[PDB]
A paper describes a structure:
The DNA repair factor CtIP has a critical function in double-strand break (DSB) repair by homologous recombination, promoting the assembly of the repair apparatus at DNA ends and participating in DNA-end resection. The amino-terminal domain of CtIP (NTD) is comprised of an N-terminal sequence (nNTD), responsible for CtIP tetramerization, and a C-terminal coiled-coil sequence (cCTD) that includes a zinc-binding motif, with C89 and C92 as ligands.
A double C89A, C92A mutant (Mut) CtIP-cNTD protein was prepared, which crystallized readily and showed improved diffraction properties. We determined its crystal structure at 2.8 Å resolution by molecular replacement (MR), using as search templates two coiled-coil models comprising the strongly predicted coiled-coil regions flanking the zinc-binding motif. The crystal structure revealed that the cNTD region spanning residues 31–136 folds in a highly elongated dimer of uninterrupted parallel alpha helices. Within this helical structure, two coiled-coil regions—named here CC-N and CC-C—comprising amino acids V35 to L84 (CC-N) and I117 to L138 (CC-C), flank the zinc-binding site. The coiled-coil structure of both CC-N and CC-C follows largely the expected heptad-repeat pattern of interdigitating hydrophobic residues. The residues surrounding the positions of cysteines 89 and 92, comprising the zinc-binding motif, interrupt the coiled-coil conformation and form instead two alpha helices running parallel to each other in the dimer. The loss of zinc-binding in the mutant likely disrupts this hinge conformation, allowing the near-linear helical conformation observed in the crystal structure of the cNTD mutant. Crystals were assigned to the trigonal P32 space group with unit cell dimensions: a = b = 86.6 Å, c = 42.6 Å, α = β = 90, γ = 120, with one protein dimer in the asymmetric unit.
Numbering used by the authors:
A (entry chain A): 30 to 141
B (entry chain B): 31 to 138
Amino acid sequence: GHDREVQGLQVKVTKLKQERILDAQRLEEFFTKNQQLREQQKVLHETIKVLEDRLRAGLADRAAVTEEHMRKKQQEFENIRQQNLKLITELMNERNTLQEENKKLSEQLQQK
Amino acid sequence: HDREVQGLQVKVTKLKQERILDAQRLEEFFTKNQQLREQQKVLHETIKVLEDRLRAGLADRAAVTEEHMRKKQQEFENIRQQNLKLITELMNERNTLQEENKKLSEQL
């Protein structure tokens, strides 16, 4: 009757009011979880910047630092080569002046 | 009970409308939540792709320079031992000429 129908309606109003308390707080949780993901993406973007800065820095630095050593290694070799070339020329000149004198004495003994 | 039962059924339908609207806002927050989830996976995939380019770039520059240090020192040692061989050949020839000259000078 009138009492039962009013009782049934007041129950529906109470149950809906409790669900609205839960729904409003579920929205607040979704908002905080989304803002947490945004601040987490800020950190990941900073990490991407450091990696892209080290891709250009590591490529352009090692390309010039390794050339510094390839250059200085040949300079070491060229100094040794220059010392060896001076030895080769002095010995070749000393040998030629000696070998000419050997044929002069060898033909002198045969003619006599 | 006529103006009261009607007065409650309106409040029920108003509350149901507020829960339907909140259910739509929960769908909006949920879809925006999964979008940021997929964006983080992209950032994680991007970070891993860049970290792999580091390992590939370093192992390449470390192996290319090792090929240069190997072939350069192979050249310098082939040249140096070529000069050592030549210098010793000239020295032995100089010595054997001085011996023969001193022998021939005494023969006369």
